[PDB]
Amino acid sequence: ARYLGPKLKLSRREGTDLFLKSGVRAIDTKCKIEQAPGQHGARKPRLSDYGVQLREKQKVRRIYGVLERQFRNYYKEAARLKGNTGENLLALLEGRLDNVVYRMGFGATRAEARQLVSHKAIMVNGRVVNIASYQVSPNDVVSIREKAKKQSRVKAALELAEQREKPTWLEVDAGKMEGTFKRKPERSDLSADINEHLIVELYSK
Amino acid sequence: VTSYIGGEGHNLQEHSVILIRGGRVKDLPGVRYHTVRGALDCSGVKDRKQARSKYGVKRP
Amino acid sequence: MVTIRLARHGAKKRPFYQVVVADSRNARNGRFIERVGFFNPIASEKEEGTRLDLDRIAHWVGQGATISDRVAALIKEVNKAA
């Protein structure tokens, strides 16, 4: 169901910073990033056309914390929806509750946001929700319950979110731990680096 | 028919009831099947660790 | 004898009755002439719940179709009751 392994190892293999081990400190400089995937990171890969696609797919999975079976289902939904197939893949991932909770600032990492969702802390439209893959509808109000409000893990994690870019599509109160998911996320608003194109190709064959 | 006994060593002899799966060897002309190691009287291969679903061996 | 009865569809522990005009001999879920609305017992206080097309009921009950114990009361529920 979850990875629960060495998280920063995934970032080296992929190369870029995946925000798995983001947390309290801003920058790591604490893994020999890029040049050490495993025992043979010095080996320059040839890297085929199937490779680059499969690396790009694994990047987007490992960022959002999703497995192949559930990720393949997002592609199937993304294809059936109107407009661009690539933009839908990412938009459906960004609409996940564990992703929204991370983007609100209620969690130093996305795994923390997932557990915070799982453990009955998160609540939306006056209803408790346990599911990380809960598709957050446009015009919703995610929030933390009064029992687990202002605990140790959340207040330190919300201060990290000030250093972050902060999305335009959602808004956060910050005083009373209350969020507001407004519109669906745009392509140009977020990332500007992870290529959807190559993921659309991989599943088509 | 004839069936190839995979792995190193075996407990098959004379009779002994064995389970047979499909799959040619591509070497022995005529042989077009494999004996499933682990199933029925055909025991697992002794001292195999990697790839033990094939060859029917338990945990270490 | 044609009769207006509930068909019972829906998942386990979550019934959804398809009130339907069928022959008495035919099975519960099987053969029918035409479906005439529905009933949802686990709908609760919200938007939808029970819908029953009363114009089609007059076409069969007026002719000669018996109404079952439940469908007779869902007529009593939709008309007046409140």
Add this chain to the structure above:
Amino acid sequence: NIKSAKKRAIQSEKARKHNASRRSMMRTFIKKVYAAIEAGDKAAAQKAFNEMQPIVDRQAAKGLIHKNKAARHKANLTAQINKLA
């Protein structure tokens, strides 16, 4: 057999003893008309037809004979009387 509604296995045995008797009675009275037809003028045939007409209609009403069976046994049989004699 493994039912208390076996009653119907006898009850129906009791039925056909009676049901064959009234049926056989009718078809003998119809045979009496067909016997009169062949070599007989407009007299003996219509007497036999006047006798069986009440008997065939009665058995039609009880559910032994269907009303169409009875209708033919008049229709085709009156034509034998009408055409020949």
Add this chain to the structure above:
Amino acid sequence: SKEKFERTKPHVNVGTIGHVDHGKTTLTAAITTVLAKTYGGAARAFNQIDNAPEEKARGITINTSHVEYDTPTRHYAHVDCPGAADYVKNMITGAAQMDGAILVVAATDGPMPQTREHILLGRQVGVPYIIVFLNKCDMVDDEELLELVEMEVRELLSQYDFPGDDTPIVRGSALKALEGDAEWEAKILELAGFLDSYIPEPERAIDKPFLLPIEDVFSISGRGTVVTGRVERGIIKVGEEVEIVGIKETQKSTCTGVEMFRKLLDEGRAGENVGVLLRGIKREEIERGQVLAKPGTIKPHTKFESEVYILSKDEGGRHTPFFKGYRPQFYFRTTDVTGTIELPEGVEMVMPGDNIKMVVTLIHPIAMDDGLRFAIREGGRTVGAGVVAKVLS
């Protein structure tokens, strides 16, 4: 399997013991017709105790047959043993579950070699009490000859470590009580009184968790495979989880009906022979020797340390030394099993009549715990009793 067995009167597991062709099985036939006539229980006959081709053309019994005769005080449950030298293996299962035996020595022949072998197997396994019965009497019309046989039985029991003189010796012909002789019917009614008086109420273990050794597996065109045996400890409720442990490996199961001589039961209590029914198990895969335990209580083992007491010539056993590689038969609860011996360091040879511990690797695994009693046998005779010390596997 229709009438419900009402739990009234204490259950006691009785059985006949004695020489070959000594009126051992015929005693069981006499006890049924005598008790059923006067008191008013179920009748039965001498045929149903032993039919088949094997016990007709020959006449000799092999299978441990069972009988259920009732009395005012107690509800007895008979276990007729085979008796011959060839049938000692299936006898020990019948003799282990037996609480209080009925010895059968006869007034014409007297004590014989098997009688000594039977009582030898009774002590080491578990036979607390024993009662003598002279099973001929009428043939030799004499006062002095019949009474001289009674003396040698008192000698045998006292020589082999039983009460001997205290045991109530009874006389009576089995064939005479089968028909309807008023003097001989009353004399076997006296044996029923001796069973009540001498043998006390047996001590059960209805507290510590469920275990049941299997004596004989059936495939009842009924329900499925059925297993018979005395419940050694605990209870058996219907629709309860039961783990079958012993030979081969281990299999999960559930009880779906306990019974007592073709009659229904709710709770199969300890210390009584019951036919427990198993769900989803074939006739071949489950075999004799395995035990019906509660899940988690017992685990099958193929290696164990054990304090073995080897017997000498006087007690009845080996008379020569032996070294590692010796393979005798280890009789645990019901079945026997072969196993190689590995002696401790600083012990060159095991002399007869000696107390030592030793590791024993068995060829078949059997369910066992610390403090389990067993009796070693080899070559149609006993070798040494002992107890389990430590588990290894």
Add this chain to the structure above:
RNA sequence: GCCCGGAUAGCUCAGUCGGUAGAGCAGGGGAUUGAAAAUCCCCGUGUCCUUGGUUCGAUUCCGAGUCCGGGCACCA
């Protein structure tokens, strides 16, 4: 539950009525030709299916077992 047969070095078989078991084919310390048809030398290379007993001494005589072969039964 009980009656019977079967097992001999890596494989296929000889040998026994107590005198301590051998043959080919095998294979190995073994030489030829980058490996080689034909060559040489060389060992048996052994829990006599396992274990105990009668015994000076058991493959061999007598119990008990192993797994496998085929045979006859019992229905809580």
Add this chain to the structure above:
RNA sequence: AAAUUGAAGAGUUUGAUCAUGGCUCAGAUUGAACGCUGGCGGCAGGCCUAACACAUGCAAGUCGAACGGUAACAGGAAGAAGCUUGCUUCUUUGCUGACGAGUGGCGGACGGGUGAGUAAUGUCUGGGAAACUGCCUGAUGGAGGGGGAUAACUACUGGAAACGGUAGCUAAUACCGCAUAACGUCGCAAGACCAAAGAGGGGGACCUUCGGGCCUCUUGCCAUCGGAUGUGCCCAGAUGGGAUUAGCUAGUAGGUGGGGUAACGGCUCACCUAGGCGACGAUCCCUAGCUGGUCUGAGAGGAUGACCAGCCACACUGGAACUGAGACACGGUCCAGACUCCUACGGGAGGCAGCAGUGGGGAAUAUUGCACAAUGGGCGCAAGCCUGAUGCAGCCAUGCCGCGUGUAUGAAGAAGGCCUUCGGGUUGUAAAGUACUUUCAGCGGGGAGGAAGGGAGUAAAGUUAAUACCUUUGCUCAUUGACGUUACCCGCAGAAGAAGCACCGGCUAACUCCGUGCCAGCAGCCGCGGUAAUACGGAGGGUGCAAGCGUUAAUCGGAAUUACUGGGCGUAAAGCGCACGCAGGCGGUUUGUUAAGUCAGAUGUGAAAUCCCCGGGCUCAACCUGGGAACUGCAUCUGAUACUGGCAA
């Protein structure tokens, strides 16, 4: 508003090449199986072979308002006998309520199960009728007088049993007269002919001969004519493969006449004619339930028809009918055969392709589950009682979906492993430790919604002679859950209980080395392995996938490698040796004329589910579900008549 956004290649012939062309692989799948590791929930699923043989419990009963029964049973009332005079014994009483048995009525033909047969009798769409239709219902109103008998019960026997006989006796809505008859049946019409059953809840008035005469109402019973409903038939096309099956066929093909069918018909007969089918595949052969759909595909197609739903077919194997509104009848009948059982050797029972269960054959596949609470379904005037229908309790990762085996910080870049150019690298922020949360499991307490009703009493409105009963509607009562220690909620304790198995030369993301030296083995293809291996075992980093993953079988895909969309035939496989020519396919050209094709429109229909879009509903999700589109149809009816055909000049 929307209703499709959907089309990848690679290895492999050669010294190298381009082509041709096979071979193999990457992805989807599933009634899967086995293998390895073996924690959860939700909605599903689960003998494909032997349509094999079956023990044990069950699966269709039900009605006292049809009637004898003064009752088998359990219990009140007039009276009796014991004696603790109300404690006990006990005969009468329709008399206490009901009901074992029985005739009756209506159900058992529906509802469940399985594909043996079936290549058309069947199935699909579209048609037509020449029909019947219990119970539902719209009219037309009758519904009057009788009489044998007949079980049960006796009585008396026969039989080992199953199951009878003979003598009475009696009951009914049972059963047959009877008068009675229509817009009914028959006839050219005049005529003739044709039916029924009473119950039950209540009653003022007057008959009481007390059985109550008699009025009310509710229901039954009839008579056709019409509904609605199923069912029977019939025609059109469609519905597998084979020509190494081209001839088949005598009730065969048609006619007249008789019989029979609910209905028409060689359905069946007698005679008459000599046909009929057939190259747009008869015949014979092999295989096969069919469909909605399912899987796959860019789509066309290809394959398939488990689960759910419609239709057919079959019930130990071959027959036949009886009864019925409906059967030529899964748990009716009677034969016949084979197979097990019982016996007094004479004759008897006998049907799991219901639901559990079992033995078998097998790669393989459930509980001798609990309940009518629920929607049905049966009978009933209602309560009811029956139900393996249905729901649901368990089992199995066989699956689909969603959860979890924590989530931050953490450098001495520790130890240990593995590699090394012995400098170090790597395992690795991995772990240890520090921040903490504590969804699931586990405990302890709250607790919905599936429940509509049914029942007992009340005020009124109908009904009527009547403030009575009856019918209807408000209104007060106490209740109805197999699931169920429920869904869901809240407190508790402490990361505590919680992992996978592939492969890693190439194709295909992933290599270092100790190698078992063409031995052991690998392998899906090319190929590896012969004292320095990314291709074998092993340790070991990863690569990869997750409660599953592999291997295997099976269908499609890629395969434009059966090509209609969409290939070819000089030399790669492939132009008959060359003509003539009927059937068939195609056909120059201008004016008419039709409307077959063709297109446009319209109406009917294309079952529901499924798919799709828009939605909604369960903590989200699978899942369920409201509403539209679609179902490449077909049918008709009316129009364009350019183009094709026909009929013209």
